[PDB]
Design a protein around this ligand. Structure first.
Ligand SMILES: *[C@@H]1O[C@H](CO)[C@@H](O)[C@H](O)[C@H]1NC(C)=O
Ligand SMILES: NC(=O)c1ccc(Cl)s1
Ligand code: NA
Ligand code: NA
Lengths: 254, 12, 28
């Protein structure tokens, strides 16, 4: 996260770290949506152009974390994966359309002050809150800037960013933008900055409903062209649009 | 080496 | 879940985090 701040303890208790077993390293963010299901970006698990195609046994998820690199004894919980589910129409060939995946855990994770699921939006909450200018919140342990000399945070970072008008999103890039994406970030003339960056993808873009005071995951950190560049925006998977697939997977395999 | 080793039980 | 999106250290205690108000103020 660029131009964010350190998270408060328990601020994002649905935050999940996708962790490579060997070598031991951060791969991506992710989010807890129930005691057995974790949501992330498909490209965190499958991206053939970079020879990426992880199997369940390659990975762990670490839940309840705050520190990036520390083993947070008595606080974090580390879970093995039972099964990965990638959206069947995830478009890794072109533009990361439908950049969404689910991971079922082998055992349920115990909830605590530090571990708690986020809500997925209903149609109405999505319609009401997915509006240009409305801000959501992005969290992760990714890099602090696009370019750095070996740069990376001690603890989970947080940044609040406004949703951007679709024509502005489209006009910022040569990539084909679909209805399964939205973009967020400040415009060059807006005086504030911030973005996701490398290592944040797969993590959540959340909004706090003013109707019921619950946090909803509206987006998944999907892609950007650099980090925090003027005139560029981060792109997020539109969770509500893909929710029928989420429900189908959980209903069938849950 | 950046990350603290996690308990071996999670790598079995 | 029925209890989704309510944080033990924040909403469950009626404590606000340091920047959630920025989000609320944008929902115009
Ligand atoms: C990824 O790996 C699985 C299992 O090894 C394989 O069946 C699948 O075809 C691979 N997908 C791609 C796009 O290579
Ligand atoms: N460089 C990156 O990985 C990203 C920047 C903005 C988003 Cl969203 S992902
Ligand atoms: Na364009
Ligand atoms: Na930008």
């Amino acid at each position: 996260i660029v131009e964010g701040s350190d998270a408060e303890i328990g601020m994002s208790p649905w935050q999940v770290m996708l962790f490579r077993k060997s070598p031991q390293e951060l791969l991506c963010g992710a989010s807890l949506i129930s005691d057995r299901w974790v949501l992330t970006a498909a490209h965190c698990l499958l991206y053939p152009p970079w020879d990426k195609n992880f199997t369940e046994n390659d990975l762990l998820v670490r839940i309840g974390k705050h520190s990036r690199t520390r083993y947070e004894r008595n606080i974090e919980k580390i879970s093995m994966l039972e099964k990965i589910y990638i959206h069947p129409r995830y478009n890794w060939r072109e533009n990361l359309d439908r950049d969404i995946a689910l991971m079922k855990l082998k055992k349920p994770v115990a909830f605590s002050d530090y571990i708690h699921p986020v809500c997925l939006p209903d149609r109405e909450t999505a319609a009401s809150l997915l509006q240009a200018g409305y801000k959501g919140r992005v969290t992760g342990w990714g890099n602090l800037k696009e370019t750095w000399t070996a740069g990376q945070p001690s603890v989970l970072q947080v940044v609040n960013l406004p949703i951007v008008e679709r024509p502005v999103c489209k006009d910022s890039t040569r990539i084909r933008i679909t209805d399964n994406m939205f973009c967020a970030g400040y415009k060059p003339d807006e005086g504030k900055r911030g973005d996701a960056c490398e290592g944040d993808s797969g993590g959540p873009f959340v909004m706090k409903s003013p109707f019921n005071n619950r946090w909803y995951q509206m987006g998944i950190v999907s892609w950007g062209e650099g980090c925090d560049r003027d005139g560029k925006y981060g792109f997020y998977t539109h969770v509500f649009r893909l929710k029928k697939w989420i429900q189908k997977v959980i209903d069938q395999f849950g | 080496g950046d990350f603290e080793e996690i308990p071996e039980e999670y790598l079995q | 879940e029925a209890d989704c999106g309510l944080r033990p250290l924040f909403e469950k205690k009626s404590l606000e985090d340091k920047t959630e108000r920025e989000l609320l103020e944008s929902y115009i």
